[PDB]
């Protein structure tokens, strides 16, 4: 996250840190005790699926304070339509091996109904994006969880205001064009969270692009609303052997 602030400990309790071989991989979003939403591309190059770890209740990477909860990732589900090394359909659903325990420091973000998301949430201007990503384009990653308020743009407006990435119906634009504020490398898979009438919902997933906080360009996020039904169906399904699962979309 570029141009944000530290998320005060416990104020981003749905934030997930994904590790591979103990190294920072990506972000994620807790939506239930055993389910995490991330970005497909995070898993493009995964060699050994058995060493994937999800951490909840994380804040400061430099210390252990006992609020942290680590779980092995049992399943990574990606849509059939996703092509590695690209941006369209950049979403993944992760099943934890064992549920996390809900605490003051570990809480799921609400996955909204599609209608609600499309009719209401989509019109909430500002939403929060978070992670332990790079603090700067070509910079070092954060030790403390960072958060950033970003405004959403209608795709038409985005395209107009921009000056490349093709914006599909499975994406949306959010942020700033002045190169001051963006999500960044290391943040991918993290939440774009939207407040409505006292409650927070998952509306986006930090995808990727070339660089961060590039003048004349906005952040592009996976439009979660397109995936609600897909996610819901999967969550009702029994686990399958083998970590990686490609599931038809729609």
């Amino acid at each position: 996250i570029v141009g944000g602030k530290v998320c005060p400990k416990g104020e981003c309790p749905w934030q997930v840190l994904l590790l591979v071989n103990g190294a920072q991989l990506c972000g994620g979003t807790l939506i239930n005790t055993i389910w995490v939403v991330s970005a497909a591309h995070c898993f493009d190059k995964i060699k050994n699926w058995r060493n994937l770890i999800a951490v909840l209740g994380e804040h400061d990477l430099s210390e252990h304070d006992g609020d942290e909860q680590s779980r092995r990732v049992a399943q990574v589900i990606i849509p059939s339509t996703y092509v590695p090394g690209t941006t369209n359909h950049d979403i993944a659903l992760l099943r934890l091996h064992q549920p996390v325990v809900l605490t003051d420091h570990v809480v799921p973000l609400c996955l909204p109904e599609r209608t609600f998301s499309e009719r209401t949430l989509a019109f909430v201007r500002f939403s929060l994006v978070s992670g332990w990503g790079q603090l700067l384009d070509r910079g070092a990653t954060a030790l403390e969880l960072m958060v950033l308020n970003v405004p959403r743009l209608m795709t038409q407006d985005c395209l107009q205001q921009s000056r490349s990435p093709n914006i599909t119906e499975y994406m949306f634009c959010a942020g700033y064009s002045d190169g001051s504020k963006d999500s960044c490398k290391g943040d991918s898979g993290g939440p774009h969270a939207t407040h409505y009438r006292g409650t927070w919902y998952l509306t986006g997933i930090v995808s990727w692009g070339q660089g961060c906080a590039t003048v004349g360009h906005f952040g592009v996020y996976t439009r979660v609303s397109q995936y609600i039904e897909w996610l819901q169906k999967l969550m009702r399904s029994e686990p399958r052997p083998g970590v990686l699962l490609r599931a038809p979309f729609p």
Partner: protein
Amino acid sequence: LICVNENGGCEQYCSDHTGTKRSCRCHEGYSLLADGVSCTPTVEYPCGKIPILEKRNA
């Protein structure tokens, strides 16, 4: 009332019905109040709420 407008007055989720009918609903871990629009938590840790903040104002 219609869901597309003002969220049908619903705090959370909204369903249109046959007639001038509307039903509000709530996410798991919430229950609908008798006002037919509001959602209140039924569990300790409902989704999309920040405990340290909820407490901060409790």
